[PDB]
Design a protein around this nucleic acid. Structure first.
Lengths: 109, 333, 189, 305, 293, 49
RNA sequence: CUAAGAAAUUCACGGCGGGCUUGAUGUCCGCGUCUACCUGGUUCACUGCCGUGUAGGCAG
């Protein structure tokens, strides 16, 4: 569970240097808020209106979308809610989402 | 015997999508040139007001949240400001042939089910179920929130043989109750028409028109779609409403759920009121299943006892089982 | 400050705008009520705000004469807020007062409008318009520039008056019908 | 093995043609003993003129590329070589082989000296990277400016400075400069743990790590094993094979003032970790510790787990 | 008992999008044929709306249904929690009617809080209010919205009758459909301020208009019972009762005058707060919303 | 479309808490439909053989 | 003070010629998406603005 958040942060870092300006791309369905959840470049292109949209608006929806994708990575059945092992999985999902959100809070901040 | 591992029934009483239009009361006679209610768009902006986790975060973060509110755009639908009266119109086919499956593995289970339902039919007609359906047409259940707080509601039901109105019914949908099912002459006529339709002994096509005064320009309530995220939040990632060729509309399953609020016969009470007819007969707004499967009252237990082993329940639970067969579904394993 | 009067004022909420629109609407209502009847020497008095902060101010202290700015609280179309805050009548403010340049004062508060207008319709060519509208030709002076929340210009700019900077011993005098002390250092309450 | 008073992030270093052999039994990333010797060389040539003490090193290895090839039907790999100049008669040279690789590593240097208060942090950082830009790191040249050497400034950071929130905050602000990185640590105790697990047949430690960098296909009554991490074999120091000699005794030594013993290197285990999974950064650093009366010369990351 | 995981309340006092039409004063009885106010272009590229140059008096018209059944939710997990909440709201109603909330709602209708910027700088405002059963005037009430202050809720008998009507509507004892007409002198050719879409102005079928939720915000400005200050003014009724312009969360949960804290203390553990705090809680239920977890 | 749980539950996990919590998460779906217009009452179906 | 320190893989080349992928088919039955919202700085101490020139009548 920690390896998924670690690999996701490593993938965001490895993508967040090659593209100079992380512009809004046609077809960025996960790039609606992932236009700042991805590489946010505060250049002349990504101006103060981009530096203020991603400045004040945080990537919690990227974090909440990532937490939903982590919940939907494995399936959902009577084992995730009818046992303490599913309770352990839910507590680990909440802990990993809180850890990734505490990481992303210092990203734009 | 065993149950069929693949049963399937088809929906009887299938309605259309209801379309909303708008006009002035005392023009209900000329209520056919009336312009449609058009799903518009507006921009809202509101604070954070939900039950935030108490002492999750510091109150300076609460003060900072109000500095940065969200702003979203929603679909609304209002009457035109000259008009005070909504008009909701749909059509209904009462098909009939109710106990016959449309997919069935077992050849003896089909015969036993059809003998069971034929025993029900010649034992007692569909007059109870059709009387309750004629209630849910005469009172405007299908005006879901559009009835709530409305001053006057009138339902007009027409029978349609050819391109021609055969018999017309008119009602006062507020004087006819929402909870009790009483006796009336015109509703017994409509009940025996719907009962002849369900029994397979005639053709029934109804035109159901409901006239609810609300006031000069108020909000009407179509049914609501869910949002695919090709277009951004600037562009309704908040609220889309349902429509047709530029007219505000209600889904057909919404109206059909308003029609099969039959079930007074569930072990809690009838003082709560009738509910919809579901297997494990549930309510979405209450968030619970009435008619639990550990009690012996859901559709599957009653059906398997009455078909496989001839344990005929009480008459009202037979009305429940036949009403689930009129609803239609994907039954079986 | 050269303002011989000190108009009484008191803050309060406003529904038609925030506190910035509250201060802009208050200065506009004062300059359209008191500066709608008579008088010329109705200068500027709003030095309670910080100089380097670059704000318009919120201290309820009008800076005009008695008759030249007293009719702001008795405006013939200036109702709707006469009881929502602590109001009053005319009075006299201290001699040491900041000449808050929220008025029709004349300075380099706009290189585009006033500067480009002197380049275009001031006996000059387009080179004068290019030399008139730099970044140092459009900026407010050291005075509390009230935001002109009225039908002043095509856009909604402020009441910019590039006068002498934020001080205490200003020299005020004859403003115009729009109530401009942006070059006349006037006192306040 | 002193605890560090600071950390120094040599931020981004392209290495030209390093040594990708590392041992007689490995071939990948170079030995961490090269990194320990590099930081000790920086301790020699500028680390005393600033009155500091550079001990730890944190390996990062952003981008890797080795000069190898797989020879067309064979499953293993071979190395790409160089032409050496000709012989004395100009015939040809006898070929020895050397693997060569291109690293992009980042170094985290622990500092212990009393000169941390006498000098500004930027002058320390500038002089360290300006000296290290003229050195070599695994037998490989440390490359200057390229197309995207924009994070050219070195940074210095005292780990003791501030509150616990301040320390952990400035830590997680450092980890934003290790972005595709993968830190290399020592995992000796896991080697002994798996040896104590599978020590039924043979408790030889060579068989243990010789059956860990692998896929272990177990059969029907296929259940291949699960990888706990990116466990890779490393060399982990030297063990003696000779009694130590006086500085004049061994013929053809590098000098005549240091004692020389013939040794054998000493294989180990460690595994690559993202800079988020580590708790702090002072636990990540490599140190050299030797027991000289015996022949145990080794390096590890002490106080990791 | 705990609280319901899903609570939802549907709103009472639901207004319509008010339509602005201009016209001259002393056309004040024949106001049904006044021409509307159009949103147009000026220059930048903005949208503004102004009166015609021979028209001084703005006219704002909207209707309002006062529904009733305020305590009853419309989505609810626990039926025991619903029973306790309905007994709690019935305890409120049998202790005292809605007449205090009705007077404060009728004060927000009697002034022109729904004329947001359009009232600031107006030399006469008249609010005519009709009760409508059929297409008729059952009883009319015309006012003077500058004498009836925006700040200090005074005493008046016509407001008492109009609050009797609104209290009968909030209880469930009658059908209340109020039509609100607000005349306001701004001057000839002056600027009106309709509400602003995501910069364009909000419009209907070729006329300028105010959003419905903004007038619904203008009606529920009641909350004179703060933890902060009883000297500034009334604000709207929100959970975590907040002003966006001021930026301050008044009624913070580090005090105990919060909506959720009051509601949980008075429903679950029967800790009934002060009477004005009960007015606040019932006003947040007349507001409606999605409460619970 | 928004439906509920009406399928034949496997009688090893049919608990009141389990069923109620299954109803707490209603399956949202999207469907393709085909109706007639609100003024047409006839379907024309045409093919060549 | 680093399995330390050193290093030229080179030249040249024709991938061509041919080819039938076919025959057959039922995607079906059923469904409540609700609940609530101020885009209010002067979208400029300024665009048209006596002097573009801290001076001014300035749709203030």
């Amino acid at each position: 569970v920690a390896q998924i958040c670690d690999e996701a942060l490593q993938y965001a870092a490895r993508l967040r240097e090659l593209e100079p300006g992380w512009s809004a791309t046609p077809g960025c369905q996960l790039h609606d808020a992932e236009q700042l959840w991805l590489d946010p470049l505060r250049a002349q292109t990504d101006e103060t209106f981009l530096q203020r949209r991603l400045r004040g608006d945080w990537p919690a929806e990227v974090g909440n979308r990532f937490a939903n994708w982590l919940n939907r990575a494995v399936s959902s059945d009577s084992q995730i809610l009818g046992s303490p092992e599913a309770a352990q999985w839910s507590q680990e999902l909440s802990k990993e989402l809180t850890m990734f959100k505490e990481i992303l809070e210092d990203e734009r901040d | 015997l065993s149950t069929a591992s693949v049963l399937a029934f088809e929906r009887k009483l299938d309605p259309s999508d209801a379309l909303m239009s708008a006009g002035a009361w005392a023009q209900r006679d000329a209520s056919q040139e009336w312009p449609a209610v058009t799903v518009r768009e507006k921009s809202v902006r509101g604070t954070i007001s939900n039950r935030l986790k108490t002492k999750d975060r510091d109150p300076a973060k609460l003060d900072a949240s109000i500095q940065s509110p969200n702003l979203q755009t929603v679909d609304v639908a209002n009457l035109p400001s000259d008009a005070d009266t909504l008009k909701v119109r749909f059509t209904l086919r009462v098909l009939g042939g109710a106990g016959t499956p449309s997919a069935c593995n077992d050849a003896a289970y089909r015969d036993k089910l059809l003998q069971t339902v034929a025993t029900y039919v010649n034992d007692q007609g569909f007059a109870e179920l059709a009387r309750r359906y004629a209630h849910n047409l005469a009172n405007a259940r299908f005006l879901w929130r559009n009835r709530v707080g409305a001053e006057a509601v009138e339902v007009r039901i027409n029978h349609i043989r050819q391109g021609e109105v055969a018999r017309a019914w008119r009602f006062d949908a507020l004087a006819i109750g929402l909870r009790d099912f009483k006796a009336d002459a015109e509703l017994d006529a409509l009940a025996e028409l719907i009962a002849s339709g369900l029994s397979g002994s005639g053709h029934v096509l109804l035109e159901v028109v409901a006239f609810a005064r609300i006031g000069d320009g108020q909000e009407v309530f179509p049914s609501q779609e869910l949002i695919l995220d090709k277009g951004d939040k600037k562009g309704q990632k908040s609220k889309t409403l349902y429509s047709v060729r530029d007219a505000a509309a209600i889904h057909s399953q919404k109206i059909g759920n308003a029609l099969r609020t039959i079930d007074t016969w569930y072990p809690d009470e009838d003082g709560l009121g009738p509910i919809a007819v579901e297997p494990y007969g549930s309510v979405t707004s209450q968030g619970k299943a009435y008619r639990q499967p550990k009690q012996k009252l859901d559709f599957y237990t009653l059906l398997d006892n009455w078909v496989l082993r001839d344990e005929a329940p009480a008459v009202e639970q037979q009305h429940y089982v036949i009403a689930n067969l009129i609803r239609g579904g994907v039954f079986g394993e | 400050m050269a303002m011989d009067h000190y108009l009484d004022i008191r803050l309060r909420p406003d529904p038609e705008f925030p506190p910035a629109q509250l201060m802009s609407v208050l200065f506009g209502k004062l300059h359209q009520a008191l500066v709608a009847q008579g008088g010329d020497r109705i200068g500027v008095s709003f030095p309670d705000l910080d100089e380097s902060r670059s704000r318009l101010g919120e201290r309820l202290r009008i800076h005009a004469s008695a008759d030249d700015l007293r009719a702001l609280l008795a405006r013939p179309w200036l109702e709707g807020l006469r009881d929502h805050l602590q109001f009053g009548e005319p009075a006299v403010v201290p001699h040491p007062t900041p000449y808050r340049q929220v008025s029709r004062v004349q300075a380099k508060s706009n290189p585009e409008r006033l500067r480009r207008r002197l380049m275009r319709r001031h006996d000059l060519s387009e080179e004068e318009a290019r030399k008139r509208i730099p970044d140092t030709v459009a900026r407010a002076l050291d005075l509390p520039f009230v935001t002109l929340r009225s039908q002043s210009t095509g856009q909604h700019f402020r009441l910019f008056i590039r006068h002498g900077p934020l001080q205490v011993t200003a020299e005020e005098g004859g403003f115009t019908c729009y109530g401009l002390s942006k070059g006349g250092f006037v006192p306040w309450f | 093995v002193t605890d560090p008073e600071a950390l120094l992030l040599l931020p981004r270093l392209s290495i030209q043609n390093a040594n990708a052999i590392s041992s007689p039994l490995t071939w990948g990333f170079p030995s961490p003993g090269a990194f320990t010797g590099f930081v000790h060389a920086l301790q020699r040539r500028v680390g005393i003129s600033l009155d500091i003490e550079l001990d730890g090193v944190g390996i990062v290895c952003h981008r890797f590329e080795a000069q190898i090839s797989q020879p067309a039907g064979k499953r293993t790999k071979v190395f790409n070589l160089t032409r050496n100049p000709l012989n004395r008669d100009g015939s040809t040279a006898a070929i020895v082989e050397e693997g060569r690789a291109h690293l992009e590593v980042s170094l985290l240097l622990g500092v212990h000296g009393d000169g941390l208060d006498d000098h500004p942090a930027q002058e320390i950082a500038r002089q360290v990277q300006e000296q290290a830009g003229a050195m070599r790191l695994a037998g490989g040249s440390i490359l200057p400016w390229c197309n995207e050497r924009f994070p050219a400034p070195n940074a210095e950071l005292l780990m003791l400075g501030g509150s616990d929130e301040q320390r952990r905050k400035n830590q997680r602000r450092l980890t934003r400069r290790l972005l595709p990185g993968f830190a290399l640590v020592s995992r000796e105790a896991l080697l002994q743990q798996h040896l104590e697990t599978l020590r039924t047949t043979l408790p030889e430690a060579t068989t243990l790590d010789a059956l860990l960098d692998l896929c272990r296909i177990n059969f029907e009554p296929w259940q291949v094993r699960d990888k706990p991490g990116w466990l890779v074999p490393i060399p982990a120091g030297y063990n003696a094979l000779s009694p130590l000699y006086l500085p004049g005794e061994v013929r053809n030594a590098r000098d005549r003032e240091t004692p020389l013993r013939f040794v054998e290197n000493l294989f180990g285990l460690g595994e690559w970790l993202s800079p988020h999974r580590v708790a702090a950064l002072s636990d990540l650093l490599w140190y050299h510790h030797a027991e000289p009366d015996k022949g145990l010369y080794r390096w590890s990351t002490p106080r990791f787990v």
